[PDB]
Write a structure and sequence with these properties.
part of a larger assembly; 3 chains; A alpha/beta (780); B mainly beta (367); C alpha+beta (89); A: 31 helices; 11% strand; globular; B: 367 residues; mainly beta; 4-stranded mixed β-sheet; leucine-rich repeat (chain A); cytoplasm (chain A); cytoplasmic vesicle (chain A); nucleus (chain A); repeat (chain A)
Chain lengths: 780, 367, 89
């Protein structure tokens, strides 16, 4: 069997145990030599030839000897038509169209409008080309020609070159084009032709589609449209252009973000048509681009398309392998294309791409993903980012392996005075690297305020240099040290630095460190004298009772000015709950508190809610997710909710409140004296009985804003009741977290009706993603 | 009152553009916001972003991950009811098992509805009447097993060779392959209706061991290097070690047993009874069995997560339920119109395949 | 110029297009390809990547083409560059 790659989709089914041997045409080196021969070599040979070679689809077409010959002769034509053709020829669509236009002029005695009879023939043959493309038929029987009033002799006479040749060995005859590329080009030509004029009166009636789509995108070139207007004396305005713009805009916007593959495919499609207005109109609403690069053609198309992206602000680009190595020299042809460029082609293209990236003004965030950069790679990236016009203010390397170019990174830090936020993570950091980084940070030119080191290996010497950096005069306001084992002597060294009055640090993060109850006590005692620390985080580190007592003593001291205190997965004793409640009874300037995976009994819950009931409480947010809770404390919870006047956010997690507990909670809520906004219930073992009370409470809760119900069994009727409660005009519930896949058709239709009624209601499974206030400052 | 509504699933951007271009041609010849699902990138990943969590995890405990929701991406069409499915995540080749025919599909191509398989294999051509009930895959993906009721043997296909061919018939004339099993060892295991288990070596194709028991006791079989587990209508539970070649434990139940499961990282044994009770047993201490979950509908299939945290159940009552190991409570729910017979899971933990009616469906996991 | 190469059934038709080509000296390649083609087939199956060798130019340079998913092509080129690094020492 011999057939095309497209035809194997059907054939693989009926044939039993087949064998596949693929047939290939011209070799890459021979094709390169042949193309190099045709190049005019007038000061643009290197760039044009390199643009030609990287295009994979172009070389797939050029693999055909006939297509290669067509490309060669078209290139020869461009030499003679130096001034006649103004457009450049870096694409197959432009070259094929140029040959068609030049051939038509050969038939014409002079440049003139087409006659009426030949226009009908041309539109007819183009429309059978489109019909063959869509119907997947290529025999092109003579019956079809007479159906649309076509004659082969006329077609061959007017075109003046071999199109749709027919050979009949038997009585019947069949018509085949010179190549499938010409047929697809003619179908694309028809796709613009129908709009200009109606020709139905004279007539008497997805890999393959990818070529048609590419040809259609290429045909939107203004020069081709102007040329077609010249041949047909009618201005050309196609209706498919609006559809293409609409498709690109639809790709641009999505709820969960932009898929990189679709973005790169759109970039490829737009780069085919060399029109600045077309791409500019097509792309305006991205605002965020995620890009994956695996070939130099990707770099070129991204550099071409990013110029017209004047709206985006965040970019994420991943290049895993193209710069894993720093130096590598090989030659494809027998004789080098250029005698001595002193630089291989990849580096110049990546330099241009990075210059384009740094040239943008609207862009202020940069992320490198999981890029693996060599030394020269990180050097050239830093050199391009060194541009003064660049206004990028954030850099991220938490997943990038750039340890070789850490010196270049340090050189970049002080040179650019504009950036503020700097993040480093999972980069093994050595002693001389710490010294260079600290020296760079000490430089007055540095304006970086936030610096993070997560899972960055640290030494005792590293700890002492860090302390010396902190005691030194810098502009660092925020700092973090997570997943780093810290020695008690190193901890003592850090504590001494903090107790100094000259230190001005507002946010300090310590997660998964080597803190011990003695170490925690020493740290709190050192922090007692400090007064400039507003945000403090301590998680996953065991804390003793004396540590909590000393922390409460520090809190009682005025000038503390500590707003947010976060503690999770650190064991807290019963007596410590008493100290916390006593602080909460008369507390100011303490808004947010968190306690998660902490053993809290029901009696401790009663003590806490009594402490909250006191009017001298300013605690906006309280989080208690995995604290073991039962149904008894729910009545006191409802009472404190009713009495409390300042609690805004309340969250509960895996604790099993129970059906009666939720009933009591909703009874307390329906009275609606409380002004709380966010309520969270997840895996609380809910039933359908509490849904009636929940709907009743919502029906008279204009204050309630957000709600979550996930991992809870809800029957169908409960879903109808809750949807009806949502639809009521009194309810103002905007953020709702539920999984739509779990429910039946009627519930989905009801939720769609809710979205129709209220345009500002959004239902999404990821409830924690929404942040009305900065809650993940430590998590980042 | 389910009242279920069915919509095209992928709504892929390429399909939308193709549909848009098709309409324009029909309009020309007639005279005579929008939401799209992310495609399966290269058939391996979806390339989505993970969901946020209320709190950070411990430094030591990074690998432990649990799922939240399941989203379907593709539907595989077979005119007959399907019984088993296979994943083969390494080769991206999904196998669908039905009563009459078997088909092989590849996940590289992007399409809403797949009707043309890459390979179609039928056992009914060889013999007059062939009824197929069982199938199995090897971890190395070098062998494919398929057992039948009236089919005299079991046929092995190898995916390493450039072409698919039959290795050995391995006949069991009087015994219908109710149960089919395989191990890391080259050794083959199978159970049949008459309480008989016969055992062959693939390299040499010889019978090495035979086991006998009461009728209907070979409905289920669990394989381990040092543990062979057997139960059926009788509800007797027997654990056998080939080394000292004797039954280790005997257990009795009130009803029949259909579903068994094992956990790789640490042994746990899951039991599914006719009255719908899930019983968990640990194979280290060997003391006692305990039950924590009860379902009204009979449970037919079961599977465990590669990480060792969650297990999903498929039963008669057209429901899919996923639980967790610490308590046995369910964490999310996805129902389907048809009675779900089979289930599957991926070693990578990114995809999942389930089939109830004649056609099969492929879902995607979110973490 | 017609070249016929058998294609393994498992590889998808889509993967064959967009091939990655690496240029290396012929003498090193002679050793690189190995004496046995069965180990070539085995590494092909365990990597799910397709490779073809051919050198007709009079120069010492030789051309290597790899077919498959970008990860497979990356791992092929990594293995080949490691072999070349072993050769130059």
């Amino acid at each position: 069997i011999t057939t095309r790659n497209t035809g194997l989709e059907k054939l693989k089914s009926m044939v039993v145990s087949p064998l596949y041997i693929l047939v290939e045409g011209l070799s890459a080196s021979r094709r390169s030599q042949l193309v190099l021969e045709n190049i005019s070599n007038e000061s643009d040979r290197i760039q044009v030839f390199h643009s030609l070679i990287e295009n994979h689809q172009l070389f797939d077409q050029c693999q055909a000897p006939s297509v290669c010959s067509l490309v060669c002769e078209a290139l020869q034509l461009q030499k003679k038509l130096g001034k006649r053709c103004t457009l450049p020829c870096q694409t197959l669509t432009g070259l094929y169209a140029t040959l068609v236009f030049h051939q038509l002029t050969l038939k014409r005695p002079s440049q003139s409008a087409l006659s009426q009879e030949e226009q009908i023939t041309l539109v007819g043959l183009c429309m059978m080309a489109a019909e063959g493309v869509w119907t997947m038929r290529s025999v092109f029987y003579d019956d079809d020609l007479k159906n649309y009033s076509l004659k082969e002799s006329e077609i061959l006479a007017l075109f003046h070159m071999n199109i749709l040749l027919q050979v009949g060995h038997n009585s019947e005859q069949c018509y085949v084009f010179s190549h499938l590329s010409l047929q697809d080009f003619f179908a694309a030509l028809y796709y613009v032709l129908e709009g200009l004029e109606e020709w139905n009166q004279h007539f008497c009636f997805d890999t393959r589609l990818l070529g048609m789509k590419r040809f259609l995108f290429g045909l939107m070139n203004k020069d081709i449209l102007k040329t077609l207007e010249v041949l047909f004396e009618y201005p050309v305005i196609p209706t498919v252009e609006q559809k293409l713009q609409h498709w690109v805009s639809l790709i641009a916007q999505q709820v969960n973000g932009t898929s990189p593959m679709d973005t790169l495919d759109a970039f490829y499609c737009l780069f085919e048509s060399q029109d600045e207005e077309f791409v500019g109109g097509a792309l305006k609403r991205f605002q965020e681009v995620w890009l994956l690069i695996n070939q130099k053609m990707d770099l070129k198309v991204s550099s071409y398309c990013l110029k017209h992206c004047q709206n985006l602000k965040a970019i994420r680009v991943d290049i895993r392998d193209l710069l894993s190595v720093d130096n590598t020299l090989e030659l494809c042809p027998v004789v080098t294309v250029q005698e001595t460029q002193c630089k291989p082609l990849l580096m110049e293209w990546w330099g241009n791409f990075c210059s384009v990236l740094g040239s943008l003004r609207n862009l202020k965030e940069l992320d490198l993903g999981d890029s693996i950069l060599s030394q020269r790679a990180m050097k050239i990236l830093c050199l391009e980012l060194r541009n003064q016009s660049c206004r990028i203010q954030k850099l991220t390397f938490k997943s990038a392996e750039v340890v070789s170019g850490l010196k270049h990174l340090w050189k970049l830090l002080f040179s650019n005075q504009n950036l503020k936020y700097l993040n480093l993570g999972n980069t093994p950091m050595k002693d001389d690297d710490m010294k260079l980084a600290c020296e760079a940070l000490k430089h007055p030119k540095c304006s970086v305020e936030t610096l993070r080191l997560d899972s960055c290996e640290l030494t005792i010497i590293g700890y002492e240099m860090i302390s010396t950096l902190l005691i030194s005069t810098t502009r660092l306001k925020c700092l973090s040290l997570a997943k780093n084992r810290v020695g008690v002597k190193s901890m003592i060294s850090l504590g001494n630095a903090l107790s100094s009055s000259m230190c001005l640090l507002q946010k300090l993060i310590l997660d998964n460190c080597g803190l011990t109850p003695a170490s925690c006590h020493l740290l709190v005692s050192a922090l007692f004298s400090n007064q400039n620390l507003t945000h403090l985080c301590l998680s996953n580190n065991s804390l003793g009772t004396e540590g909590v007592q000393q922390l409460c003593q520090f809190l009682r001291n005025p000038e503390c000015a500590l707003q947010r205190l976060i503690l999770n997965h650190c064991n807290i004793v019963d007596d410590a709950y008493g100290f916390l409640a006593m602080r909460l009874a008369n507390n100011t300037k303490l808004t947010h508190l968190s306690l998660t995976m902490n053993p809290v009994g029901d009696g401790a819950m009663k003590l806490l809610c009594e402490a909250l009931k006191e009017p001298t409480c300013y605690l906006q947010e309280l989080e208690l997710v995995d604290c073991q809770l039962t149904q008894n404390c729910c009545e006191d919870l409802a009472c404190m909710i009713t009495t409390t006047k300042h609690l805004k956010s309340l969250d509960l997690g895996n604790n099993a409140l129970g059906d009666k507990g939720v009933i009591t909670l909703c009874e307390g809520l329906k009275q609606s004296s409380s002004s709380l906004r966010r309520l969270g219930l997840g895996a609380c073992k809910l039933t359908s009985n509490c849904c009636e009370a929940l709907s009743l409470a919502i029906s008279c809760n204009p204050h309630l804003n957000s709600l979550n119900l996930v991992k809870n069994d809800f029957s169908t009727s409960g879903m109808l009741k809750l949807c009806s409660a949502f639809q009521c005009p009194v309810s103002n519930l905007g953020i709702i977290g539920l999984w739509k896949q779990e429910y039946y058709a009627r519930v989905r239709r009801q939720l769609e009706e809710v979205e129709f009624v209220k345009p500002h209601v959004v239902i999404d499974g990821d409830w924690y993603a929404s942040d009305e206030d900065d809650r993940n400052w430590w998590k980042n | 009152d389910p009242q279920p509504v069915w919509d095209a699933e992928p709504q892929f951007c390429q399909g939308f553009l193709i549909q848009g271009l098709w309409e324009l041609f029909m309009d020309s010849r007639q005279k005579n916001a929008d939401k799209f699902l992310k495609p399966l990138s290269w058939g391996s990943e979806v390339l989505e972003s993970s969901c946020n969590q209320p709190s950070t995890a411990l430094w030591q405990l990074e690998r432990f991950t649990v799922p939240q929701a399941l989203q379907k991406v593709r539907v595989l069409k077979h005119q007959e009811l399907l019984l088993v499915v296979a994943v083969s995540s390494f080769t991206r080749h999904v196998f669908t098992c039905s009563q009459s025919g078997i088909k092989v599909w590849n996940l590289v191509n992007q399409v809403a509805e797949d009707r043309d398989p890459e390979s179609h294999l039928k056992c009914s051509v060889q013999d007059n009447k062939v009824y197929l009930r069982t199938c199995l895959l090897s971890s190395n993906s070098r062998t494919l097993f398929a057992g039948g009721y009236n089919l005299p043997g079991v046929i092995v296909w190898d995916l390493a060779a450039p072409s698919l061919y039959e290795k050995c018939q391995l006949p069991c004339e009087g015994l219908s392959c109710q149960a089919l099993a395989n191990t890391k060892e080259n050794m083959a295991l199978a159970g049949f209706t008459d309480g008989t288990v016969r055992i062959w070596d693939l390299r040499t194709q010889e019978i090495v061991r035979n086991l006998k028991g009461p009728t209907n006791s070979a409905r289920n079989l669990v394989v381990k290097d040092d543990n062979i587990w057997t139960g059926g209508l009788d509800a007797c539970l027997r654990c056998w070690d080939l080394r000292m070649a004797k039954v280790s434990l005997e257990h009795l139940f009130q009803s029949q047993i259909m579903s068994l499961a094992h956990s790789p990282t640490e042994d746990w044994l899951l039991l599914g009874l006719a009255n719908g009770q899930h019983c968990l047993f640990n194979s280290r201490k060997r003391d006692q069995v305990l039950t924590v979950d009860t379902k009204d509908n009979t449970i037919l299939g079961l599977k465990f997560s590669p990480n060792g945290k969650w297990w999903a159940s498929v039963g008669m009552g057209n429901f899919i339920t996923v639980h967790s190991m610490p308590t046995g409570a369910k964490l999310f729910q996805v129902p389907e119109v048809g009675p779900v017979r089979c289930f599957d899971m991926t070693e990578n933990g990114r995809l999942i395949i389930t089939g109830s009616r004649d056609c099969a469906s492929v879902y995607h996991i979110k973490y | 110029s017609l070249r016929l190469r058998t294609r393994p059934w498992w590889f998808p038709i889509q993967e064959v297009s967009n091939p990655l080509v690496l240029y290396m000296e012929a003498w090193v390649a002679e050793r690189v390809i190995g004496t046995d083609q069965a180990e070539i087939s085995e590494i092909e199956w365990m990597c799910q990547a397709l490779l073809t060798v051919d050198s007709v130019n009079s120069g010492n340079l030789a051309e290597i083409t790899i077919f498959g998913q970008p990860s497979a092509q990356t791992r092929m080129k990594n293995i080949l560059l490691n072999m070349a690094a072993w050769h130059k020492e």
